RNA sequence: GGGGGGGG
DNA sequence: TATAATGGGCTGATGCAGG
DNA sequence: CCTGCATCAGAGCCCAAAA
């Protein structure tokens, strides 16, 4: 009944009184220091559902990643608005990125092994330890690294560099390390005799990166 | 972990874990607060900057927000957000009406009455007429909102067996039944902790049921009997109009000791 | 401005779940229930009480009320007290609290994300006597039931399980609330059956079936008498405000007389009878009339039969039956002179 | 979102 | 209680956002 | 300030009125 009696008392328009009574909009009793779009939320302000959700529960967004495509950012990483998340995915807001469902889990297992190697003497650089990537030796001319035991070859190839393991019966008699710059001349499951070349080492040979 | 013992992924030996190919990336505007020891706030609690989160007071919150406790990542997330009080419906309005000191508003509105532009004085008058109305009368504005809804005595909305043994009933009974259902259903949805979307829908339906009972058709579509276009006759409809209570049973009546014939 | 459209707009603000997300929420809800079970044992509390306390903190301060069955009035004092005992748990126990919280959070999300399913089921049930929104709310009640009973391990999609409970909930709603005169759910089912049966019979026979034709089709136990009695029960009342045609100036209720309140004549008649009735028991003697008056009662209706009269009339007990006959006998003589009471025989 | 066959 | 099913079918009196 | 301009509540009596 216009002018609304409730409406007149509260300084609420016809539309406003409708929106609160019929659940189209919130009206704020105690802002508790909220601020929206740069201005502080003042008591008796009307909020839409979207405004209330941004205020009350915070703002967030979820971006689909094309199947098989891996993201250009890591789980937990702070992100600016506009930063590129995936080849086809661009983030719309600042905040913490969270992985939803990793399709592939890679476990890097820790291996600590004792392996031997033989090099000329004028060609090797003396160090007490070698960091990944560090130059191990420089060969004036190509050198053939030879088997020091007879056995069948168990070949284990890394990303770069290789491991080679000779065994008689099932007991490994030797563990060799082939750095980068050393090309295996034998294949897995190959029979070798003492003194035959396993790998050619040419030029500068260095620790692999991993 | 998986549904059945097979297909689980168990770590073969010592190693470190890397996550790849996520289904989607969720960007949250939030602060991350890692914790080594026990965490003292559980998830869902609301928190203000400086409030102690975990590890006996070592780690605390930088923002106002909502606690998300990640037991995998071993971190307490705080999603930036406020304890803001904002409501919908007649519940909200009844509070603001309760929170009225009419004395003060009269004072305020009188000060506005000392002002040109005529319109300022005109609107302050209309407001002041409602304020003064309540003050003299003794009515509390929050009474314009119903908590208990009255139910008219039954003989005034009868269910009677007519000649044929058939039942005839007043429309008010159907309007009340709708009301009762929605009230009862609302109580159940509350006790069962339905999401706000469901409770909001029920609450707004409840307003509509009360609205049809008091004045049907006044706001929104008129409530009708199933398979009839006839608007149900509400209390407002009963009071008013040519057929209404005043012009039919009050200002004129059928009478005894009367007759009629051709002249 | 349109309540249906608004609700449709609000549901559409929650994106639908992926198979992973659907399974994730379902998983979290199940695990959370297991967590609440464990917390009862450790704490010595009640799983329902624990469930409501966990649930209160997720929804917020907005919803706090007594829940039917809980032994304690649920108010901020008791939930602070009880929450502080849960937060008083050791690290390995206190973890179970966190599980329960996230279960309630996920339950909320799962329900909200399935609301569009309920709409698509309810729209097919329109026209049975419940409004669309009433059906949605009853349908939503079933959806809530479905989330609590869902076992995600079975690998069925959620939509598959939910649909059963929602259909059940709507159908129970329609059966319970659609009639002004409420009918037991099982009886409503039988009535609907007669309709289906009769509609077949009329479609094959090319004319309306008899009670007998329906009774055969219904099988054993059914005769025409039972078909007739069931339909009577199934008759819905009609509005007193139904216009009698003309629609301008006539209501059905205006033609219904009031049979309860006595008419002026009837009230007059009953008054006249009491006055002539007392003016008659006093004309023999009040006392042998008082004994008789005591046996029937002007106002009260004090007829036993033989015992009670053992006490206070003034005589012992066989005698009052006798003075009853002579009171009635003198009355009968006294009646032939003052034969004015004949006309009250109708 | 307000309305109709006859008699005066 | 479990294939999956996910967004409806003619007038006058008065109080208002807008040239 | 004022006007378009919108939203609401009015529209004769009694008797048959054939539902």
DSSP, residue by residue, A112-150: ----B----SSSBPP-S---TT-EEEE-SS-EEEE-SS-
- Cβ atoms of A7 and A14 within 8 Å: the answer is yes
d(CA B218, CA A68): 58
User: What are the chain B neighbours of C98 within 8 Å (beta carbons)?
Assistant: 39, 42-43, 69, 71
- Using CA atoms, how far residue B150 sits from A20, A99, B210, B232, C241, in Å, is 24, 56, 11, 18, 22
Q: Kindly determine whether residue B20 and residue A102, on different chains, have CB atoms separated by under 8 Å.
A: yes
Q: Kindly determine whether residue B167 and residue C238, on different chains, have CB atoms separated by under 8 Å.
A: yes
d(CA C131, CA C121): 14
> Distance (Å) from CA B28 to C1' E13?
56
d(CA B141, CA B94): 8
Q: Enumerate the nucleotides of strand E whose atoms come under 7 Å of any protein CB.
A: 1-9, 15-17
Query: Residue A158 — φ and ψ, nearest 5°?
Result: -90, -175
> In this structure, what token pair is assigned to residue C18?
């992926």
User: Which residues are paired to C76 by β-bridges?
Assistant: none
Closest nt to residue C13, judged CA to C1': E7
User: Which residues are paired to A195 by β-bridges?
Assistant: none
> Distance (Å) from CA C142 to C1' E7?
19
d(CA A43, CA B82): 14
d(CA B217, CA C118): 28
d(CA C185, CA C168): 12
Picking from C95, C177, C237, the nearest residue to B167 by CB comes out as C237
Helix (H) or strand (E) holding B169: strand B167-169
d(CA B10, CA B256): 97
> Distance (Å) from CA C201 to C1' F19?
30
**C108 — contact with chain B (CB < 8 Å)?**
yes
Q: Was C343 annotated as part of a binding site?
A: yes
Q: Kindly determine whether residue B160 and residue C256, on different chains, have CB atoms separated by under 8 Å.
A: yes
Q: Kindly determine whether residue B166 and residue C235, on different chains, have CB atoms separated by under 8 Å.
A: yes
The residues of chain C that CATH labels 1.10.10.10 are 183-236, 262-343
**Through-space distance between the first and last CA atoms of chain C, rounded to whole angstroms:** 64
- Cβ atoms of B84 and A18 within 8 Å: the answer is no
**Closest by alpha carbon to C105, among C35, C6, C9?**
C35
- Cβ atoms of C133 and C4 within 8 Å: the answer is yes
Closest nt to residue B116, judged CA to C1': F1
**A100 — contact with chain C (CB < 8 Å)?**
yes
B222 touches strand D (CB under 7 A): yes
Chains that touch C (3 or more CB pairs under 8 A): A, B
Picking from B32, B79, B85, the nearest residue to A32 by CB comes out as B85
Closest nt to residue C10, judged CA to C1': E7
Tell me which residue has tokens 């060969």.
A139
- Cβ atoms of A193 and A181 within 8 Å: the answer is no
User: What are the chain B neighbours of A22 within 8 Å (beta carbons)?
Assistant: 89, 204, 207
- Cβ atoms of A118 and A176 within 8 Å: the answer is no
**A24 — contact with chain C (CB < 8 Å)?**
yes
Q: Was C164 annotated as part of a binding site?
A: no
d(CA C175, CA A105): 53
Q: Was C159 annotated as part of a binding site?
A: no
Q: Kindly determine whether residue A58 and residue B200, on different chains, have CB atoms separated by under 8 Å.
A: no
Beta strands in chain C (DSSP E): 238-239
Q: How many helices (H) and strands (E) does chain B have?
A: 7, 11
Contacts of B56 (CB under 8 A, 6+ apart): B37, B40
Q: Could you tell me whether strands B52-54 and B65-70 are parallel, antiparallel, or unpaired per DSSP bridges?
A: unpaired
Shortest CA gap B228–chain A (Å): 27
d(CA C197, CA C194): 5
- Cβ atoms of B233 and C241 within 8 Å: the answer is yes
**Closest by alpha carbon to C134, among A40, B179, A28?**
B179
Q: Which long-range contacts (CB under 8 A, 24 or more apart) does C331-336 make?
A: C331/C280, C331/C281, C331/C284, C331/C292, C334/C280, C334/C283, C334/C284
C78: exposed, middle or buried (Cβ count in 10 Å: 0-12, 13-18, 19+): middle
d(CA A162, CA A202): 15
> In this structure, what token pair is assigned to residue A53?
């959700």
C158 touches strand E (CB under 7 A): yes
Give me the resolution in angstroms, 1 decimal.
3.3
> In this structure, what token pair is assigned to residue B165?
């043994």
Q: Kindly determine whether residue A60 and residue B29, on different chains, have CB atoms separated by under 8 Å.
A: yes
> In this structure, what token pair is assigned to residue C23?
């399974």
Round the CA-based radius of gyration of chain C to a whole number and report it.
Answer: 35
Question: Taking the CB of residue C1, how many other CB atoms lie within 10 A of it?
Answer: 9
C84: exposed, middle or buried (Cβ count in 10 Å: 0-12, 13-18, 19+): exposed
> Distance (Å) from CA C173 to C1' E3?
27
Closest nt to residue C4, judged CA to C1': E8
Q: What approach was used to elucidate this structure? A: X-ray
Alpha helices in B23-98 (DSSP H): 89-98
Q: Which of C7, C11, C17, C18 to mutate to test the interface with A (most CBs of A within 10 A)?
A: C18
Question: Taking the CB of residue C112, how many other CB atoms lie within 10 A of it?
Answer: 19
> In this structure, what token pair is assigned to residue C223?
């005769």
Question: Taking the CB of residue B186, how many other CB atoms lie within 10 A of it?
Answer: 18
| Protein residue closest via CA to C1' of E2 | C161
d(CA C253, CA C43): 64
CATH 3.40.350.10 for domain C1-179, yes or no, is no
> In this structure, what token pair is assigned to residue B224?
């009708």
Q: Find the largest Cα–Cα distance for chain B.
A: 118
Closest nt to residue A13, judged CA to C1': E16
Question: Taking the CB of residue B227, how many other CB atoms lie within 10 A of it?
Answer: 7
Question: Pseudo-torsion of CA C279, C281, C284, C288, nearest 10°?
Answer: -150
d(CA A159, CA A132): 13
**B164 — contact with chain C (CB < 8 Å)?**
no
> In this structure, what token pair is assigned to residue C26?
């379902």
Crossing angle of the two packed helices C132-149 and B171-191, in degrees rounded to 10: 20
Contacts of B136 (CB under 8 A, 6+ apart): none
d(CA C292, CA C295): 5
Contacts of B204 (CB under 8 A, 6+ apart): A22, A23, B89, C3, C6
d(CA C286, CA C302): 18
> In this structure, what token pair is assigned to residue A181?
């710059």
Query: Residue C251 — φ and ψ, nearest 5°?
Result: -120, 155
d(CA B98, CA B77): 38
User: What are the chain B neighbours of C52 within 8 Å (beta carbons)?
Assistant: 193
- Cβ atoms of C239 and B168 within 8 Å: the answer is yes
Chains that touch A (3 or more CB pairs under 8 A): B, C
Question: Taking the CB of residue B233, how many other CB atoms lie within 10 A of it?
Answer: 19
- Cβ atoms of A153 and A162 within 8 Å: the answer is no
**Closest by alpha carbon to B33, among B18, B48, B54?**
B54
User: Which residues are paired to A123 by β-bridges?
Assistant: none
Q: What is the DSSP letter of C125?
A: G
> Domain C262-343 is in which class?
mainly alpha
d(CA B50, CA B35): 16
**Closest by alpha carbon to B175, among B236, B245, B228, B223?**
B223
d(CA C171, CA C163): 12
Q: Kindly determine whether residue C13 and residue A49, on different chains, have CB atoms separated by under 8 Å.
A: yes
d(CA C198, CA C75): 56
d(CA C239, CA B170): 6
Omega within 30 of 0 (cis) for the link into A3: yes
Helix/strand/coil for A18: helix
Helix/strand/coil for B83: coil
Query: Residue A172 — φ and ψ, nearest 5°?
Result: -65, 125
User: Taking CA C234 as the corner, what is the angle to CA C232 and CA C239, rounded to the nearest 5 degrees?
Assistant: 95
Shortest CA gap C50–chain A (Å): 25
**Closest by alpha carbon to C24, among C105, C128, C91?**
C105
Tell me which residue has tokens 């890397």.
B18
A vs B, Cβ pairs < 8 A, gives: 208
Q: Was C223 annotated as part of a binding site?
A: no
Helix (H) or strand (E) holding B210: helix B196-214
Picking from A22, A24, A101, the nearest residue to C20 by CB comes out as A101
User: What are the chain C neighbours of A24 within 8 Å (beta carbons)?
Assistant: 6
User: Which residues are paired to A197 by β-bridges?
Assistant: A146
- Cβ atoms of C63 and C53 within 8 Å: the answer is no
Round the CA-based radius of gyration of chain A to a whole number and report it.
Answer: 35
For domain C183-236, give the fold: Arc Repressor Mutant, subunit A (1.10.10)
**B44 — contact with chain A (CB < 8 Å)?**
no
- Cβ atoms of C230 and C194 within 8 Å: the answer is yes
d(CA A33, CA B64): 9
d(CA C162, CA C113): 12
| Protein residue closest via CA to C1' of E7 | C8
The count of C-alpha atoms lying within 13 angstroms of the C-alpha of A10, restricted to the half-sphere facing its C-beta, is 26
Helix (H) or strand (E) holding C8: helix C3-11
Closest nt to residue C246, judged CA to C1': F17
d(CA B177, CA B186): 14
d(CA C189, CA C178): 13
Helix/strand/coil for C163: helix
Query: Residue A51 — φ and ψ, nearest 5°?
Result: -65, -45
Contacts of C188 (CB under 8 A, 6+ apart): C175, C179
C75: exposed, middle or buried (Cβ count in 10 Å: 0-12, 13-18, 19+): exposed
The residues of chain C that CATH labels 1.20.120.1810 are 1-179
Q: Could you tell me whether strands B24-28 and A95-99 are parallel, antiparallel, or unpaired per DSSP bridges?
A: antiparallel
Q: What's CA A95's distance to the chain center, in Å?
A: 18
d(CA B122, CA C19): 62
> Distance (Å) from CA B218 to C1' D1?
9
C6 touches strand E (CB under 7 A): no
Q: What is the DSSP letter of B25?
A: E
Q: Kindly determine whether residue B44 and residue C253, on different chains, have CB atoms separated by under 8 Å.
A: no
Closest nt to residue C124, judged CA to C1': E8
Contacts of B6 (CB under 8 A, 6+ apart): none
Contacts of B9 (CB under 8 A, 6+ apart): A105
**Closest by alpha carbon to A209, among A138, A135, A115?**
A135
Shortest CA gap B53–chain A (Å): 19
Shortest CA gap C255–chain B (Å): 10
> In this structure, what token pair is assigned to residue C31?
């695990």
Q: Enumerate the nucleotides of strand F whose atoms come under 7 Å of any protein CB.
A: 1, 8-19
**Closest by alpha carbon to C111, among B48, A168, B193?**
B193
Residue in chain A lying closest to B199 (CA):
A23
d(CA B185, CA B195): 14
């Amino acid at each position: 009944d216009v002018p609304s009696k409730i409406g007149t008392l509260l300084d609420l328009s016809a539309t406003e009184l409708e929106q609160v009574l019929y659940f189209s909009k919130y009206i704020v009793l105690d802002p508790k220091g909220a601020i929206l779009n740069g201005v502080p939320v003042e008591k008796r302000q009307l909020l839409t559902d979207e405004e209330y959700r941004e205020l009350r529960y915070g703002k967030q967004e979820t971006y689909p990643l094309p199947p098989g495509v891996d993201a250009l950012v890591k789980d937990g990483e702070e992100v600016v608005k506009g930063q590129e998340l995936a080849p086809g995915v661009v983030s719309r807001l600042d905040g913490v990125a969270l992985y939803r469902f990793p399709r592939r889990v890679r476990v890097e297992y820790v291996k600590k092994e004792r392996a031997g190697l033989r090099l000329p003497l004028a060609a090797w650089v003396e160090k007490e330890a070698y960091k990944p990537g560090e130059i191990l030796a420089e060969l004036p001319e190509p050198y053939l690294f030879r088997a020091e035991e007879e056995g069948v070859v168990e070949l284990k190839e890394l990303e770069e560099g290789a491991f080679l393991v000779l065994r008689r019966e099932d007991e490994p008699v030797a563990t060799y390390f082939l750095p980068v710059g050393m090309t295996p001349l034998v294949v897995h499951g190959e029979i070798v005799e003492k003194g035959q070349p396993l790998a050619e080492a040419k030029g500068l040979l260095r620790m692999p990166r991993q | 972990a998986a549904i059945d013992p097979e297909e689980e992924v168990i770590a073969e030996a010592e190693g470190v874990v890397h996550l790849h190919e996520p289904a989607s990336i969720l960007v949250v505007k939030a602060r991350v607060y890692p914790f080594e020891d026990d965490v003292e706030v559980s998830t869902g609690d609301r928190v203000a900057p400086g409030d102690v989160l975990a590890d006996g007071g070592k780690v605390k919150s930088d923002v106002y927000g909502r606690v998300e406790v990640d037991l995998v990542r071993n971190v307490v997330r705080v999603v930036e957000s406020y304890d803001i009080d904002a409501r919908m419906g007649a519940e909200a309005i009844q509070q603001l009406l309760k929170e009225l000191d009419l004395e003060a508003l009269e004072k305020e509105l009188l000060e506005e009455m000392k002002h040109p532009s005529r319109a300022r004085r005109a609107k302050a008058r209309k407001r002041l007429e409602v304020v003064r109305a309540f003050l003299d009368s003794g009515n509390r504005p929050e009474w314009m909102i119903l908590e208990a809804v009255p139910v008219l005595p039954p003989d005034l909305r009868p269910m009677v067996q007519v000649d044929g043994g058939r039942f005839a009933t007043s429309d008010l009974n159907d309007l009340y039944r709708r009301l009762i259902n929605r009230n009862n259903r609302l109580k159940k949805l509350l006790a069962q902790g339905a999401p706000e979307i469901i409770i909001r829908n029920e609450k707004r339906m409840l307003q509509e049921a009360v609205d049809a009972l008091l004045d049907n058709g006044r706001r929104g579509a008129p409530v009708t009997n199933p398979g009839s276009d006839r608007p149900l006759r509400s209390l407002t409809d009963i009071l008013s109009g040519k057929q209404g209570r005043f012009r039919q049973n009050l200002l004129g009546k059928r009478v005894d000791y009367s007759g009629r014939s051709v002249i | 401005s349109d309540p249906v459209r608004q609700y449709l707009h609000e549901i559409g603000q929650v994106p639908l779940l992926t198979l992973e997300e659907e399974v994730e929420l379902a998983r979290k809800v199940e695990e959370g229930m297991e967590a609440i079970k464990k917390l009862s044992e450790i704490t010595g509390l009640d799983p329902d009480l624990i469930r409501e306390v966990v649930r209160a903190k997720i929804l917020g301060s907005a919803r706090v009320r007594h829940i039917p069955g809980l032994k304690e009035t649920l108010d901020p004092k008791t939930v602070e007290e009880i929450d502080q005992k849960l937060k008083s748990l050791p690290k390995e126990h206190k973890r179970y609290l966190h599980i329960a919280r996230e279960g309630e959070a996920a339950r909320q999300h799962l329900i909200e994300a399935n609301l569009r399913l309920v709409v698509s089921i309810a729209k097919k049930y329109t026209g049975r006597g419940l409004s669309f929104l009433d059906l949605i709310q009853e349908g939503n009640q079933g959806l809530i039931r479905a989330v609590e009973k869902f076992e995600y391990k079975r690998r069925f999609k959620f939509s598959t399980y939910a649909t059963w409970w929602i259909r059940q909930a709507i159908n129970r709603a329609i059966a319970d609330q659609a009639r002004t005169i409420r009918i037991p759910v099982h009886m409503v089912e039988t009535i609907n059956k007669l309709s289906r049966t009769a509609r077949q019979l009329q479609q094959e026979l090319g004319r309306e079936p008899t009670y007998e034709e329906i009774a055969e089709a219904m099988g054993p136990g059914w005769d025409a008498k039972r078909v007739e009695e069931t339909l009577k029960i199934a008759q819905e009342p009609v509005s007193l405000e139904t216009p009698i045609g003309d629609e301008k100036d006539s209501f059905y209720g205006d033609f219904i007389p009031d049979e309860h309140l006595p008419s002026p004549v009837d009230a007059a008649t009953q008054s006249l009878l009491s006055e002539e009735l007392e003016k008659a028991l006093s004309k023999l003697s009040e006392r042998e009339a008082m004994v008789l008056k005591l046996r029937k009662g002007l106002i009260d209706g004090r007829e036993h039969t033989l015992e009670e009269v053992g006490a206070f009339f003034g005589v012992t007990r066989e005698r009052i039956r006798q003075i009853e006959n002579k009171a009635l006998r003198k009355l009968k003589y006294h009646e032939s002179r003052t034969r004015k009471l004949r006309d009250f025989l109708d």
